[PDB]
UniProtKB/Swiss-Prot annotation:
This is Ephrin type-A receptor 2. It is linked to Cataract 6, multiple types: An opacification of the crystalline lens of the eye that frequently results in visual impairment or blindness. Opacities vary in morphology, are often confined to a portion of the lens, and may be static or progressive. CTRCT6 includes posterior polar and age-related cortical cataracts, among others. Posterior polar cataract is a subcapsular opacity, usually disk-shaped, located at the back of the lens. Age-related cortical cataract is a developmental punctate opacity restricted to the cortex. Overexpressed in several cancer types and promotes malignancy. It comes from Homo sapiens. Receptor tyrosine kinase which binds promiscuously membrane-bound ephrin-A family ligands residing on adjacent cells, leading to contact-dependent bidirectional signaling into neighboring cells. The signaling pathway downstream of the receptor is referred to as forward signaling while the signaling pathway downstream of the ephrin ligand is referred to as reverse signaling. Activated by the ligand ephrin-A1/EFNA1 regulates migration, integrin-mediated adhesion, proliferation and differentiation of cells. Induction: Up-regulated by UV irradiation via a TP53-independent, MAPK-dependent mechanism.
Length: 174
């Protein structure tokens, strides 16, 4: 496996764009046994019309044709927000865009293509938190053939309580 991007590894948390900025997706640091553990997180479950975007850094294609994308994340149960939260979602979306040049900070939703809805096998229920039984999901998708010099991945939150803990992008060589 040839790793193109690895969020959880030692500096993978740098260089990501969030749009809109200030509310949506948020880089947070947990600490476990003195190890910093970073995540992109969002939980705007109480207001509708959520459209929050998280975009990776420019990633070079090299000789990759089909890339594999591994996501690790938790999703908080919508029923754990007392009284209702009717706009709460339990999924998020995976997108990408190819390009021959670096866009810098110029991100546009419309230039991106949807890969798939990403859905947890295991929701984390209310009691799971105190039980220290938080449920980590692993989901893999692939895209291809890629032909451009580079590419971006992006994550649309539509109103779920998601913690994106790991994002690993690789292709198969030999």
């Amino acid at each position: 496996e040839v790793v193109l991007l690895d969020f959880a590894a030692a500096g993978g948390e740098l260089g990501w764009l969030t749009h809109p900025y200030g509310k949506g997706w948020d880089l947070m640091q947990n600490i476990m046994n003195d190890m910093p553990i970073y995540m992109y997180s969002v939980c705007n479950v109480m207001s509708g019309d959520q459209d929050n975007w998280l975009r990776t850094n420019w990633v070079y294609r090299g000789e990759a044709e089909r890339i594999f994308i591994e996501l690790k994340f938790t999703v908080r149960d919508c029923n754990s927000f007392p009284g209702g939260a009717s706009s709460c979602k339990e999924t998020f979306n995976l997108y990408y865009a190819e390009s021959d040049l670096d866009y810098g900070t110029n991100f546009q939703k419309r230039l991106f293509t949807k890969i798939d809805t990403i859905a947890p096998d295991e929701i984390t229920v209310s009691s799971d938190f105190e039980a220290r039984h938080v449920k980590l999901n692993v989901e893999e998708r692939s895209v291809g053939p890629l032909t451009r010099k580079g590419f971006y991945l992006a994550f649309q939150d539509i109103g779920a309580c998601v913690a994106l803990l790991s994002v690993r992008v690789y292709y198969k060589k030999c």
